[PDB]
Design a protein around this ligand. Structure first.
Ligand SMILES: [Mn+2]
Ligand SMILES: [Mn+2]
Length: 314
């Protein structure tokens, strides 16, 4: 099964800049080369070039609506294209607003996909509930069928068509949810494992329940959207919205190892690595290293070890 790396150096999803440098930082560590050592064939699509929309005025409180909408429409096309050729798409973030295009394009080919969203945040604010207007905090609102018509049509997103229902997504790692967002996830009956549930059950039981919920009735493609801020800031400090009390490095790898074992990974997003936000060079190395480790883990690298078949090592 082939892999296609797609860079999304974009940061208009938030006011802070820097996350657009994420793809470069990840590639610098040798991510592409390391992936080629797994049992997957790897193709690098390179980084997408995003055309900035001039005079991109704010739609009400929403910032950079047209630019974000355009970047995501382009990403959606690329991902849909790769999915059509039966390859696994891997999007290297910039900001999480890019999940709109990544998941939308993925859903065009696999409408029955299930989403596992690892994040400290729900990123489900709507243009009407957001207090900042940052689209990086509203991705899920543009993807859910249940929220269609719950907010005004935003300039640059008419191409969007709600990909999944609130019942096809599972959140893991939540600990910084706005009131409006909490109201939404409760009202919509969305399945989630906040840090409270992770502490209660243990990451082992969390994954067990996550798969039983999403795959119990039918096996289907999995789209893993991973926000590095889902892990505690002591592991992934170089990110824009760090929140204390997060998933450990170990828990993060456990998630990816279990997802690899399902053999259902169809799409993956590695988002929010902002190289300009490390307080030191090492904080960046630390963040990039775990983002890289998570990616390789999603593709077969196991902590117990690995070895190539049909090879008598002795
Ligand atoms: Mn996020
Ligand atoms: Mn986040």
């Amino acid at each position: 099964k082939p892999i296609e790396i797609i860079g999304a150096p974009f940061s208009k999803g938030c006011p802070r800049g820097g996350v657009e440098k994420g793809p470069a930082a990840l590639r610098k560590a040798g991510l592409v080369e390391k992936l080629k050592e797994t049992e997957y064939n790897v193709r690098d699509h390179g980084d997408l070039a995003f055309v900035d929309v001039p005079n991109d005025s704010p739609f009400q409180i929403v910032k950079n609506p047209r630019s974000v909408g355009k970047a995501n429409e382009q990403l959606a096309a690329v991902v849909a294209e790769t999915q059509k050729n039966g390859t696994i798409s891997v999007v290297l973030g910039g900001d999480h607003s890019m999940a709109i295009g990544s998941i939308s394009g993925h859903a065009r080919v696999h409408p029955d996909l299930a989403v596992i969203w690892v994040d400290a945040h729900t990123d489900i604010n709507t243009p009407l509930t957001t207090s900042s207007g940052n689209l990086a905090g509203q991705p899920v609102a543009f993807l859910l069928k249940e929220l269609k018509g719950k907010f005004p049509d935003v300039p640059g997103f008419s191409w969007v068509t709600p990909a999944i229902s609130a019942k096809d997504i599972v959140y893991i790692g939540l600990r910084d949810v706005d009131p409006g967002e909490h109201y939404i996830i409760k009202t919509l009956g969305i399945k989630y494992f906040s840090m409270t549930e992770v502490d209660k059950l243990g990451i082992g039981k969390v994954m067990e329940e996550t798969f039983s919920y999403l795959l119990g009735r039918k096996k289907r493609p999995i789209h893993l959207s991973f926000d590095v801020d889902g892990l505690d800031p002591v592991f992934t400090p170089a990110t824009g919205t760090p929140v204390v009390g997060g998933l450990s490095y170990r828990e993060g790898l456990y998630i990816t190892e279990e997802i690899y074992k399902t053999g259902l990974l169809s799409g993956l997003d590695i988002m929010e690595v902002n190289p300009t936000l490390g307080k030191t060079p090492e904080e960046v190395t630390r963040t990039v290293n775990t983002a890289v480790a998570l990616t390789l883990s999603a593709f077969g690298t196991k902590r117990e070890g690995n070895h190539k078949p049909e090879t008598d090592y002795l």
